[PDB]
């Protein structure tokens, strides 16, 4: 899991990770964005 030190986009980071790596898998852990490639 790619735990990036980014702020969550509301409640998750799916759209964030969809931009970063491509997949729309990303959740808000500790206020950070963990992408799931």
| Domains detected in the chain | 2-35 (3.30.30.10)
Look at strands 26-29 and 2-4 and give their pairing.
unpaired
Alpha carbon distance 8, 16 (integer Å) = 8
Q: Which helix (H) or strand (E) is 17 found in, with range?
A: helix 14-20
29 touches 4 (CB < 8 A): no
Q: Please say whether the beta carbons of 21 and 13 come within 8 A.
A: no
Identify how the structure was determined: NMR
Structure tokens at 1: 């899991």
Percentage helix, strand, coil, to 5, in the chain? 20, 35, 45
CB atoms inside a 10 Å sphere around CB 36:
14
Distance between CA atoms of residues 1 and 4, nearest Å: 9
Please report the beta strands in the chain, taking only residues with DSSP state E, as ranges in sequence order: 2-4, 26-29, 32-35
Cβ(20)–Cβ(5) below 8 Å: no
Contact 8, 15 (CB under 8 A): no
Map tokens 């206020």 to a residue: 31
């Amino acid at each position: 899991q790619i735990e990036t030190n980014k702020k969550c986009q509301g409640g998750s980071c799916a759209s964030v990770c969809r931009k970063v790596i491509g997949v729309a898998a990303g959740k808000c852990i500790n206020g950070r964005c963990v992408c799931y490639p």
